[PDB]
Amino acid sequence: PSNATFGMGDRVRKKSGAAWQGQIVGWYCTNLTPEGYAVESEAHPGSVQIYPVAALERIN
Amino acid sequence: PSNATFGMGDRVRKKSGAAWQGQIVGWYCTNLTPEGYAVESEAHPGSVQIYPVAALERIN
Amino acid sequence: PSNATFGMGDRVRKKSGAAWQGQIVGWYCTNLTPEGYAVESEAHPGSVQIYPVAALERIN
Amino acid sequence: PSNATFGMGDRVRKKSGAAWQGQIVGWYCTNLTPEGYAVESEAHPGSVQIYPVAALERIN
């Protein structure tokens, strides 16, 4: 996108707290989370979790 | 999209099993769920859940 | 329990951020969340979400 | 429990569809899922997902 922090297929991980790591497979937007991503785990194929951009970092 | 079943802002609900109802706020795609949507609950603002297109119906 | 903050069937809600409200239907414990609860939404029957005790308040 | 299929600490995995594997750390019960478990991923510490007993198998 003309702006999004990450793109489809980027490899990312949660920066802290519960762990999560895998590829970007989607996106979402609400008032509470104006920039969110769906991430498919690279360890557990098919399992997807969603998070706000701030919780995530590209790897790298 | 030139194809997606639903668009941003459509009002939908889960067709069966656990209930869910609200607006489409996002989308995702994996091998297991090639067409998925993120839906923000209309009863619990800020809470989003994701589901495959087949689990959902537009209301209607 | 001889200690838990809430019991099965208590009515609670998330104190801030994304909303959630319903009845306590379960419990969990990890190093990261040593006292967690499963809560079934009172608006969307069958849908359960889990949270750490600190995120929750009894209503009341 | 005098009945539960699994106990705290059992190692289990999802039998099919999206993958998940780790240790039992909790439990839940609703009309829709009268016997459910919370499972902490062994690959992503701190991340917990909940499932009905039928979706799970002990490993084994």
Residues of D with CB under 8 A from a CB of C: 25-33, 36, 38, 40, 45-46, 48, 50
Three-state secondary structure string covering D4-33? CCCCCCCEEEECCCCCCEEEEEEEECCCCC
Determine phi and psi for B12, rounding to 5 degrees: -140, 170
- Residue A18 is encoded by which pair of tokens? 């519960």
Rounded Cα distance between B22 and B19, Å, is: 10
Q: How was this structure determined?
A: X-ray
* Largest interatomic CA distance in chain B: 31
List chain C residues with CB under 8 Å of A18. Answer: 32
C47-55: long-range contacts, CB 8 A cutoff, minimum separation 24? C47/B18, C47/B19, C47/B20, C47/B49, C48/B18, C48/D28, C48/D30, C48/D33, C48/D36, C48/D50, C49/B47, C49/C20, C50/C26, C50/D26, C50/D38, C50/D48, C50/D50, C51/C14, C51/C20, C53/C5, C53/C6, C55/C14, C55/C15, C55/C16
Which amino acid would we find at residue A26?
G
3-state secondary structure of C16: coil
List chain A residues with CB under 8 Å of D41. Answer: 19, 43-44
List chain C residues with CB under 8 Å of D50. Answer: 26, 38, 48, 50
Domains within chain C, CATH numbers bracketed: 1-60 (2.30.30.60)
- List the single residue in D with minimal CA-CA distance to B17: D32
Cross-chain CB nearest to D46 (options A19, A21, A41): A19
Q: Which residue do the tokens 């701190």 mark?
A: D46
CB A10 within 8 A of CB A4: no
Which amino acid would we find at residue B13?
R
- Residue B27 is encoded by which pair of tokens? 């989308």
- Residue C13 is encoded by which pair of tokens? 């809600």
- Establish whether D51 is a catalytic residue: yes
Rounded Cα distance between C19 and C6, Å, is: 19
Resolution in A: 1.8
